[PDB]
Scaffold this active site. Structure first.
Site, PDB file in Angstrom:
ATOM      1  N   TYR A   1     -10.144  34.537  63.811  1.00  8.50           N
ATOM      2  CA  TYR A   1     -11.577  34.814  63.897  1.00  8.50           C
ATOM      3  C   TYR A   1     -12.385  33.581  64.277  1.00  8.50           C
ATOM      4  O   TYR A   1     -13.585  33.698  64.559  1.00  8.50           O
ATOM      5  CB  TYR A   1     -12.102  35.397  62.567  1.00  8.50           C
ATOM      6  CG  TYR A   1     -12.042  34.424  61.404  1.00  8.50           C
ATOM      7  CD1 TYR A   1     -13.004  33.425  61.258  1.00  8.50           C
ATOM      8  CD2 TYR A   1     -11.019  34.494  60.461  1.00  8.50           C
ATOM      9  CE1 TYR A   1     -12.949  32.523  60.218  1.00  8.50           C
ATOM     10  CE2 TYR A   1     -10.958  33.595  59.406  1.00  8.50           C
ATOM     11  CZ  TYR A   1     -11.929  32.614  59.287  1.00  8.50           C
ATOM     12  OH  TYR A   1     -11.890  31.706  58.248  1.00  8.50           O
ATOM     13  N   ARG A   2     -11.763  32.410  64.289  1.00  5.64           N
ATOM     14  CA  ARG A   2     -12.456  31.173  64.606  1.00  5.64           C
ATOM     15  C   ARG A   2     -12.618  30.990  66.116  1.00  5.64           C
ATOM     16  O   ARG A   2     -11.889  31.560  66.933  1.00  5.64           O
ATOM     17  CB  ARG A   2     -11.710  29.974  64.019  1.00  5.64           C
ATOM     18  CG  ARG A   2     -12.342  29.415  62.761  1.00  5.64           C
ATOM     19  CD  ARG A   2     -11.375  28.528  62.002  1.00  5.64           C
ATOM     20  NE  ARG A   2     -11.779  28.396  60.607  1.00  5.64           N
ATOM     21  CZ  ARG A   2     -10.951  28.116  59.607  1.00  5.64           C
ATOM     22  NH1 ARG A   2      -9.657  27.929  59.843  1.00  5.64           N
ATOM     23  NH2 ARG A   2     -11.423  28.027  58.368  1.00  5.64           N
TER      24      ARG A   2
END
Ligand SMILES: Nc1nc2c(ncn2[C@@H]2O[C@H](COP(=O)(O)O)[C@@H](O)[C@H]2O)c(=O)[nH]1
EC number: 3.1.15.-
Lengths: 180, 180
Positions: free
Chosen positions: A128-129
């Protein structure tokens, strides 16, 4: 050849910058190792879009994609949004495990927005980064201005050079902005 | 008072992970100067949401916002999303001029998307640049792991504590990860 340390680099073209109004029309990927060495280059896919979607593009986009030939390539393509997503996924999967690599590139929040709406499974395959090179550019602008003004912006009108120029922008910062 | 190189730090809490389906239930801000020196702490605002929205949160967010106190603070809030936006802009207006500062914090692409959807007047007050501390977190974990462990992060579930830690995480990189 998988390796959770490898990075997925991505670049997209869209009919416009609004995920609700616009669609992806080209995608490209490049997998590096953790130290920015190319492992492989994904397919560069122009994604078929119907004429109504193509005519629905604003002025700036209609000119830019037409003159680049992307419009014609998109008009001819027999690869759908889902099919391109699967093709990119089939490629990424032999190099990087699921939910390991962040999205790497420039202005890739906007990319994540489009992947979320239009290719949710590919969006989910990333960690998700976000590894956004412009964070470093912004820090360099404030704290070491000579390192950013010293960067040699390449040509990037084609999708793989576009990614390679972003990878080379990270390199520049790793070499001249990051004590290691 | 105003200074175009001041930085706006922000952390949100949301009912879920979809910026378009879910909503904002907490916000806080902190203004630093361009060298990470805290100038002022903005208000910490719990935002009222109907009971259905709180009951509809998934298991993790039901747990997490239940036990932090936020669920109860949401229920007891009389501050709407719009009033929380106007209150935050009222504070930030004293410290940063319009469009000057990026949005600063950890994985703030998620924050900007929620702001864009739910507080677009506040989203529009930021420069288009994203200053993402977690981009450096991923670079540090890959290029210098033992500066990524040199950093002590208290598991801080107060909003201002989450932001102060984000500012301190970037301080730790300007000192031990960046050459100036
Ligand atoms: N559904 C879900 N949401 C999460 C999770 N971790 C963080 N969040 C979301 O992220 C928000 C806070 O952002 P953070 O400070 O954790 O980046 C929370 O309000 C919640 O909506 C998770 O593991 N599952």
């Amino acid at each position: 050849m998988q390796n959770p340390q490898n990075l997925i680099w991505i670049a997209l073209e869209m009919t416009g910058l609004d995920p609700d109004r616009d669609v992806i029309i080209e995608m490209a990927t490049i997998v590096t190792d953790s130290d920015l060495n190319t492992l492989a280059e994904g397919p560069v896919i122009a994604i078929h879009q119907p004429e109504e979607i193509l005519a629905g593009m604003d002025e700036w986009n209609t000119r830019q994609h037409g003159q680049s030939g992307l419009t014609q390539r998109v008009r001819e393509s027999t690869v759908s949004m889902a099919e391109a997503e699967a093709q990119t996924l089939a490629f990424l999967e032999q190099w990087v495990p699921k939910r390991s690599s962040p999205i790497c590139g420039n202005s890739i929040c906007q990319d994540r927005r489009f992947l979320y709406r239009h290719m949710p499974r590919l969006e989910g395959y990333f960690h998700y980064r976000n590894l956004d090179v412009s964070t470093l550019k912004e820090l360099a602008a404030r704290w070491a201005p000579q390192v950013r003004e010293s960067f040699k912006k390449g040509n990037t009108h084609l999708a793989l050079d576009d990614i390679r120029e972003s990878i080379a922008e990270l390199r520049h910062y790793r070499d001249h902005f990051i004590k290691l």
